[PDB]
């Protein structure tokens, strides 16, 4: 790697609100507070009619 | 009236017409009109012969024109002194050597093919004969 031209790239900690703590080298500097990760996104976990509504609204 | 869509150059030398021809066999169809004399075939002459054939056969069968007029011929107008530049292109010819199958025909009986080729041979300026496809 060339010297003195690359950005500062040191290891930080990212915490997600699902109780997750992970450590990654990154360039942002401070710690990270994440709204969602791969462990709590509904797509990753698996969390992702006319006659029916007619019968429900006009049951006889 | 046959003519190339474009060429590299507009004018060509006169050249010579020696030797005997290639493409001397009946290749696609069954009968052929083959040139025995040597000469040039104007695009107008080729067109007149083709029209006579197609009208004689009444648009059944298939007709192949085996020659193409790709050589331009120039002429000088009247009252122009000799020598002031090559003249302007007027028409296109196809040089013919003996044994050159000019036209060729399939899908028609032999007698009707002979009659159509006779009419077209009457329209052409050079000596022709009727030939038949041979197996080898």
């Amino acid at each position: 790697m060339k010297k003195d031209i690359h950005p500062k790239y040191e290891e930080i900690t990212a915490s997600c609100s699902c109780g997750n703590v992970m450590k990654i080298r990154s360039t942002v500097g401070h710690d990270l507070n994440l709204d969602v990760c791969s462990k709590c996104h509904p797509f990753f976990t698996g969390k992702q009619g006319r006659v029916d509504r007619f019968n429900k609204r006009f049951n006889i | 009236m046959l003519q190339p869509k474009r060429t590299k150059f507009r004018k060509m030398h006169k050249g010579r017409n020696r030797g005997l021809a290639q493409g001397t066999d009946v290749s696609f169809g069954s009968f052929g009109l083959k040139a025995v004399g040597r000469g040039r075939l104007t695009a107008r002459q080729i067109e007149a012969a083709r029209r006579a054939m197609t009208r004689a056969v009444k648009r059944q069968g298939k007709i192949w024109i085996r020659v193409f007029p790709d050589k331009p011929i120039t002429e000088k107008p009247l009252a122009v002194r000799m020598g002031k530049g090559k003249g302007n292109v007027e028409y296109w010819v196809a040089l013919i050597q003996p044994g050159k199958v000019l036209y060729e025909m399939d899908g028609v009986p032999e007698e009707l093919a002979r009659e159509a080729f006779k009419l077209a041979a009457a329209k052409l300026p050079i000596k022709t004969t009727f030939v038949t496809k041979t197996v080898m």
């Binding site: 006319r50 006659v51 509504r53 007619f54 006009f58 006889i60 | -």
Partner: protein, 84 residues
Amino acid sequence: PRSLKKGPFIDLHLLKKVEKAVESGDKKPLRTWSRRSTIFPNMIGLTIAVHNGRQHVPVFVTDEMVGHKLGEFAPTRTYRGHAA
């Protein structure tokens, strides 16, 4: 729209014709003038010719499409555009 407590509205002659068509199979299209009748689940798969002012437009009633009106289904104004 119609009140929920009054339920869905449908003409008696149309209801009887639909019932007869159900019990004796798919005949020729049911000719009707009732643009005011709502499509029920029981006439699924049926051809209803709704009067729209001069002709009877054929309608092919299916499942995903009940609960609306035959009047919605049969347009009344013929319009092809200005400057044509």
